């Protein structure tokens, strides 16, 4: 397992525009297109992202391409963030995947706001971090995914994904 396989599991693969858990237009492997309630807008953002008139539908390769860019951007985002990078660098490889997943889902900003958990993660206080992480809107709105990511961060193993 790895970050790609992990997120593919959490986000799934959809080839037609869909609405995510918060109702926003998304496509592929969790590629958010827009927070706007307009399908046309979503459609315009999609054509912009792919470089052609997609008519709301994409191929699997095109979906994987956006996923790649997205994974990439997520990491880079972490590395450029002064609050995140130090935590991330202190982590082992499995745990880092958990951090990437969260950022991919909720953005750099969101995650950077988990002050208390970031510190416990940095201090290697696994159980504590896991309890603090679950005290969030995140966990309450998508609990099953949240449990997978939290277990990953808590244990450093892929057991929640096997």
Q: Which residues are annotated as a binding site for substrate?
A: 32, 104, 117, 132
Among 84, 105, 138, 148, binds ligand [Kr] (CB under 6 A): 84
**20 part of the active site:** yes
Q: Residue 26: helix, strand or coil by DSSP?
A: strand
Set 20, 47, 64, 128: catalytic member: 20
**11 part of the active site:** yes
Non-local (6+) Cβ contacts of 139 within 8 A are 133, 146, 147, 150
Q: Nearest-CA neighbor of 66 among 17, 102, 99?
A: 17
- Residue 78, both tokens: 């972490």
Q: Residue 99: helix, strand or coil by DSSP?
A: helix
CB 112 within 8 A of CB 83: yes
Among 27, 74, 121, 160, binds ligand [Kr] (CB under 6 A): 121
Q: CB-wise, 95 or 145, nearer to ligand [Kr]? A: 95
Name the residues that contact ligand [Kr], by CB under 6 A: 78, 84, 87-88, 95, 98-99, 111, 114, 117-118, 121, 126, 129-130, 133, 150, 153-154
């Amino acid at each position: 397992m790895n970050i790609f396989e992990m997120l593919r599991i959490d986000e799934g693969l959809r080839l037609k525009i869909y609405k995510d858990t918060e109702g926003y237009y998304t496509i592929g492997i969790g590629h958010l297109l827009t927070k706007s309630p307009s399908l046309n807008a979503a459609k315009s953002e999609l054509d912009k992202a792919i470089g052609r008139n997609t008519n709301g539908v994409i191929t699997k390769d095109e979906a994987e391409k956006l996923f790649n860019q997205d994974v990439d951007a997520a990491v880079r985002g972490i590395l450029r963030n002064a609050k995140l990078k130090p935590v991330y660098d202190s982590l082992d490889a499995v745990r880092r995947a958990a951090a990437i997943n969260m950022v991919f889902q909720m953005g750099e900003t969101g995650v950077a706001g988990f002050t208390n958990s970031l510190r416990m993660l940095q201090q290697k206080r696994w159980d504590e971090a896991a309890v603090n992480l679950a005290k969030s809107r995140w966990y309450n709105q998508t609990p099953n995914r949240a449990k997978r990511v939290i277990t990953t961060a808590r244990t450093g193993t892929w057991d929640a994904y096997k």
